[PDB]
Design a protein around this nucleic acid. Structure first.
Lengths: 325, 324
DNA sequence: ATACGACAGTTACTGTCGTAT
DNA sequence: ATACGACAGTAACTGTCGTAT
């Protein structure tokens, strides 16, 4: 028996899918006409592609099977359109990984409708998807190398240390052992991970990570660590000292201020004089100084001093560099 | 990667509903046309029910059945991707877009068999807590289901929409337009033509009320792609389109390389180490806000309207904060 | 038993180029 | 326009063989 490397994967997945009790490596090798070792490699491959694949030990041996795992109810165009423009927005940004997964969810999701449903909602969704676009922010393009990303998620799922060369941060070029905490998709993307004894989480730019390896050591994360909370410690990406920020939006821009997102923790309070008071705690003053720049003259930096300072040092730096003086 | 591209192709042809050209299979897998032929010849062996449909003067190929149910089950990774993309909008402020993906997620889990759903449910939950998307600060989008509902309905009926627009030059006038689409962004906008040969202009959804879908045909142009219109600006605002050209000093040069300024982009390393960035777009304020991010490391060489725009807003805030 | 590498040695995929019905 | 070889040159696949659970 046989058929070429590319199609043997479907052929083996189909086999483990239609087996009740599972097949052993020597059963696969005989059904694939390939022989023990590369059937192992093929079993490898389809487990990668079908994480639903389970193995059952009836010792001494071991049998592998893909259980059913599916039973459809034909969602709406706007649901589908939502999914597509979602994925469209992501590949438009350069987030090829997040986009890929969503395009794959779409393909399998479409295929699972009937002859009728598929061609019937088709022009519906593309009508919608053309009548919707997400504006793309200017900024850095995220590194989404599903090799490095797959390695992170692998280590995280396993409770295992991740290892990589990092070209950044005070001593480039060299191999680093971390406890991976999570992935922070932002301007670029970041590994959130503890390095070394008694560390506290640091941000590792995916742009700068080569040569990942999922080590065989346990690296559990602190039981008290929350990726969200870690992200919410800063106004943007940078984790400075966490400041108490106090801003006063002029009345001219109060309507905006009252329907605006400054931080996850914001309290906005309207004032009798029509101005609006904004308080929140966060690091990332520079990143904050930038956004305040888009408020023009309608914002007063009440607190903290260090914000006031960086706002002005930033201002005068561009001001001479473009001739505002 | 490359062991599953045959299977990635077979999924694409089972969902395409009318097929791909032999050459757009090559573009959605980055393969080169000849390679794709062999992929097609091998998908056909795995999926003999694949139809070949003439669409002159090329062919389409589609799997009309759907795959085996084992190539259809979505993974925890894809499920988690939907959620991270849902929770990203929920957090943004964009609760109408978000609840269609949660609706989709819901109908995906429900379609799993019981014992399968309970086994993947924790794998995704763990997946969604190891990943989060930074929410940038900015306006909380206005997504009134009834305002969006009205707009889409009109676009589906190719009908005129009339609303009262509290903004612009005579606020309160109820206006009748041809709705072309929606630009989701800082706040959200209706892009729409108004009357005889009008040029497309943007309408804030939060400045709309009294939305009626009238039964007057409102056909759009079909040269018009909403995407083209969106990309006419650097951000949201559509003033006169400028040929913007900047040099990123060689200090911040590696960032300039892996940076997105515009869709009409071109960045090339100059000789002295600088990087030259060129793109074509209106919206000079939003652009000058972004150039503030670079501080001293960017010089504006054209246009002067962007320099005057930068110095205006640079001087506006410098006085406001005590800089000079 | 399976998990899994290191590693000669065959071959398969890639793409370019024609010749077809 | 494809459906297809053919054919060098590139790249992985394969199977044998270790060593570890």
């Amino acid at each position: 028996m046989r058929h070429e490397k590319a199609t043997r994967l479907l052929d083996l997945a189909r086999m483990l899918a239609g087996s009740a009790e599972g097949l052993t490596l020597d059963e696969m090798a005989a059904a694939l006409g390939v022989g023990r070792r590369t059937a192992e490699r093929m079993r490898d491959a389809v487990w990668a592609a079908f994480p639903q694949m389970e193995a059952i030990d009836d010792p001494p041996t071991k049998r592998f099977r893909i259980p059913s795992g599916l039973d459809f109810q034909t969602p709406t165009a706007e649901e589908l359109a939502a999914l597509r423009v979602a994925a469209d927005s992501l590949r438009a940004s350069g987030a090829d990984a997040r986009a890929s997964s969503l395009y794959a969810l779409e393909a399998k999701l479409l295929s699972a409708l009937r002859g009728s449903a598929r061609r019937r909602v088709a022009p519906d969704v593309e009508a919608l998807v053309q009548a919707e676009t997400i504006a793309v922010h200017a900024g850095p393009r995220p590194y989404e190398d599903q090799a490095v990303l797959g390695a992170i998620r692998a280590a995280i799922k396993g409770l295992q240390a991740l290892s990589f060369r990092y070209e950044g941060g005070s001593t480039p070029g060299r191999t680093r052992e971390v406890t991976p905490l999570g992935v922070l998709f932002g301007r670029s993307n970041y590994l959130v991970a503890l390095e070394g004894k008694g560390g506290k989480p640091r941000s590792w730019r995916l742009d700068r990570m080569s040569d990942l390896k999922v080590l065989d050591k346990p690296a559990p994360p602190p039981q008290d660590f929350s990726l969200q909370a870690f992200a919410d410690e800063s106004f943007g990406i940078y984790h400075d000292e966490i400041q108490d920020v106090v801003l006063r939006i002029h009345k001219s821009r109060a309507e905006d201020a009252l329907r605006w997102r400054f931080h996850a923790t914001q309290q906005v309070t309207p004032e009798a004089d029509g101005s609006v008071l904004v308080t929140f705690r966060a690091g990332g003053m520079r990143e904050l100084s930038w956004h305040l720049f888009t408020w023009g003259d309608a914002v007063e930096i009440v607190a903290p001093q260090v914000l006031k300072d960086m706002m002005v040092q930033e201002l005068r730096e561009a001001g001479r560099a473009h001739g505002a003086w």
